Design a binder for this molecule. Structure first.
Ligand SMILES: CN1C(=O)N[C@@]2(OO)C(=O)NC(=O)N=C12
Ligand SMILES: CN1C(=O)N[C@@]2(OO)C(=O)NC(=O)N=C12
Ligand SMILES: CN1C(=O)N[C@@]2(OO)C(=O)NC(=O)N=C12
Ligand SMILES: CN1C(=O)N[C@@]2(OO)C(=O)NC(=O)N=C12
Lengths: 301, 301, 301, 301
């Protein structure tokens, strides 16, 4: 036998950091969950009981906290790049570091109409994430995402004109509920190293904000022909607004809300135009995915 | 043997309802999870295989949807009272109905600064709940609550002066993080029936809003001596603002954020006044409870 | 305002303990999650910022580990009684201790047909639990339970003869699937203190084993008229087998498995006698409860 | 813009099937959760609101149930291959079907020492899974796995000789607890189509049993130098026992159990040779991965 692939490290590292402005009194908090997995000349730890090549996962954990003490933790694209770069530079035999960060929301409270200096609310379980792959000799590849953004619209969603054959029971509809949990990812151009990442730092928060804004406005305003059609519009708009993005990926569940025929009870009308009470379905669910990039077709368009 | 207690029914009934204003185009959505458990002269279903006394849980489910079609689903205190009253009135042999409702957030989206007519966001997993016990001959007992309201403050929390003995290792502190998930319950005066509940309908939304406002402002502004002291202030204020409440209960976890001593690494200072990076602890957690009512002591105060 | 009720302590305390037989080499492991909440003369911690009356939750945590080091952790009824007794004896002003323990399964592995001396498998997420309320001057009240025991039978379950009215759509059935997650609790006679608990120690493991055995055999062998009828048989048998039990409580979800009519597709027959493929329903679910004790009726039986 | 990748379908489809032997009375149950995602000439559903190319996810759901009615659902490798093959054969424009199946345990109960004909227990949340990718013109690629197999050994685990530098605090140990949740995957040789899969049907259950047996015996018997070293031994043995496997992958968390120094309390000794009570850590956790295949090095071995 031989090792074909290997990576190892510390997962589920919870990290909080506070910034305190001693002049103004305003404090700002950041909370995340971090995973760092390393690759390199480590195969003998598996094949030969050679622990000398292992940077202990406990030490990886220590390093995450040390790095958060010595550097900004925002934007997460930057923090992940600093962290990953550290491992490949510090350890000759480590050649890749894979850093995943989930950022948790702590939104400043407004009390009596004024932003409070040191009190926060988890205003959504929506996350902002990064995946930062730092690969020695091949730069830094970053995928940024938002996830867990749960939305519903009560009309202005349709689904008709789909294939009908002997497996089909679904009724066409011209007016349905649409609800999803948005997972949207934007994949950056490869960066050559930490200097190039740093040169683009403002673009990270700006692109996350654009992606969120586009997602919400397109969901709310598109008289949707399908999940497929709506999500494509989102992606095309994000690509148009940040040239340093190469692709946008969406993964959207179709969280079904079924009509309930009550006509068996006193002739109650609760379908079609009279549908008011619905049964949210926990499972199953449609699951619709696509990855959109910029076009390069020049004929047969 | 004999049956000492029994109740049965349908749990985990997911319910959506939409209201459509055909004049304005504005739609409003409501989503909940409902449980109804019944008591009464049912013991022979357990002891004698006598199914004649069972109103099937499937029929209870149907009834929940029918009741939502025929009545408002808001405030949940009212919906639960209507639902519970139905079972004790419809079925001679059913003498109590226990209705639990969890209300899920669907907050209207603002798009380009304007409220959208039919698009919503799950802006928090915080819930608004009710427990409505309708007991034939003994009226309607309602407990209202908010839960899953997750908050953090980065300073203005203290914990010193606690008992110290041979089991104690905890350091006193004059400046710590405080974070919790608020579960707050207000227990209404017994209502004689559905008419009395209906007579107080505006008070339900108003009291929920007061409880939330008080919770947030007191958390944010109290330079807290302990979870105990802060939660008591919340409760006393809610009682002062609604005379139809008899008690207020809080159940608060103390979600610990530990300092991380980094002085072993290059003399890094990350404790006390220099604490910036902390380790959120998933478990264990303090858990602090109290039920506050109005005083009746007249001496030894 | 005044404090009507209060309790506080440490929740979610994970505890492992190993026993090592140095003669035989056999090791035995125990893992639990513990909660201890205290009551007593503590109201001034809430009303007056008086921390002097607080035994810190951190110290409660320390105490749990110390108590596990100095005493057996099995049976959990005993461990909980020792732990609770400690708080009311050690602290004059603490008058009740409420100890909840969840015991996690670590079943010894059999390797090549032989029990291994130090390797274990989590063979089920089923739990064994206790609730031990130690109340100064009023002894020790113990509720023991098993929970998370998930079972299914594919036939020999029926449900017919239930009430039918204008809310009813359910078809009677003479052959259905029955599946549940068993939560069964046996409530012990009050014990006067720790000596009386210790005097009954073998009965704890024996009664847990009886309750489990009865549950499984009755589920498997009863040609069930309803969940109600089957669960009552379980309870009556457990009561008959341990006189120091006062009541047995069951709480059982009815985890529905729906037939799927496929006759629209090529005349496929998948209902009634030809039902082979079913749709497990995640929600909603029936929920059936009862508490059974011994009879005291002497006429009208 | 243009669609670079797309797939869609139905996720979280719960499926039960029963087999009834009418001669013997013995019934056998199967329960799974299925996901099917399709690829093909579908881009216009995203770009052009062209629903004609969409086989509705509702119809995919119907098809899963129909296929389970008309075919064996075991082994899951076979069921997934039949299901995936159906979509690429039935629909000219669909060119890949990605079928994921999670199989849930329903183990036959033994009652009074005899296997019961129709009663089952969920004896573990361990799963048996498949990932079956059916790609038109490129056969069928199958990855089989077991997951959620949670184990602990109380001794015969070590971790010493790891890299030590200025980021390291971890103590070397010659005797520790090792606990994990095993996720093990074996990747089959590409199959040319459904006939080739069918030709190997007995190997699926046999290889799953081998993988489980090897996992448990190696975990229990290896005096482990590290998670890395132990998992490699597992993989090499599985490869040696099934030549139609190309690779074996393990992904193992290191679920830490920390010693608790109690020497501050009455000189209690609970570390090193006297360690009996430990604190299971929920997070963070090591995470150790590798993919093992057969060797092709002929020099520098
Ligand atoms: C109702 N429905 C389907 O049956 N398939 C679809 O995904 O769930 C699909 O392909 N697109 C939809 O928007 N709606 C759907
Ligand atoms: C740090 N700490 C404790 O150790 N016990 C306490 O609850 O967690 C307590 O009783 N009250 C607190 O506010 N803080 C605590
Ligand atoms: C099918 N079904 C019901 O509709 N109600 C019942 O609980 O779920 C009930 O009261 N008892 C049952 O055993 N079966 C049921
Ligand atoms: C204690 N410990 C580490 O600190 N890193 C390791 O994974 O968690 C590692 O690389 N291998 C181990 O077996 N044990 C570990």
């Amino acid at each position: 036998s031989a090792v074909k692939a290997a990576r190892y490290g510390k997962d589920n590292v919870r990290v909080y950091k506070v910034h305190k402005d001693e002049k103004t009194g305003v404090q700002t908090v950041y909370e995340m969950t971090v995973c760092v997995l390393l690759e390199g000349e480590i195969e003998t730890s598996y094949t030969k009981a050679d622990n000398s090549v292992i940077v202990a996962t406990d030490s990886i954990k220590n390093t995450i906290y040390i790095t958060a003490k010595q550097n900004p933790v925002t934007p997460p694209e930057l923090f992940g790049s600093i962290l990953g770069t550290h491992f490949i530079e510090k350890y000759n035999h480590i050649h890749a570091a894979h850093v995943n960060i989930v950022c948790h929301r702590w939104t400043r409270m407004d009390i009596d109409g004024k932003p409070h200096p040191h009190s926060f609310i988890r205003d959504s379980e929506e996350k902002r994430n990064v995946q930062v792959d730092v690969v020695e000799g091949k730069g830094i590849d970053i995928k940024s995402s938002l996830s867990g953004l749960t939305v519903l619209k009560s009309t202005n969603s349709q689904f008709w004109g789909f294939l009908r054959d002997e497996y089909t029971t679904l009724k066409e509809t011209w007016d349905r509920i649409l609800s999803t949990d948005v997972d949207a990812t934007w994949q950056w151009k490869n960066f050559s190293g930490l200097q190039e990442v740093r040169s683009h730092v403002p673009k990270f928060d700006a692109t996350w904000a654009t992606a969120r804004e586009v997602t919400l406005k397109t969901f709310a305003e598109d008289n949707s022909a399908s999940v497929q059609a709506t999500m494509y519009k989102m992606a095309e708009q994000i690509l148009a607004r940040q040239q340093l993005i190469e692709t946008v990926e969406y993964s959207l569940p179709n969280k079904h809300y079924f009509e309930i025929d009550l006509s068996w009870h006193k002739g109650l009308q609760n379908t079609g135009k009279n549908a008011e009470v619905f049964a949210p379905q926990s499972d199953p669910n449609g699951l619709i995915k696509c990855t959109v990039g910029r076009s390069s077709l020049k004929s047969k368009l």
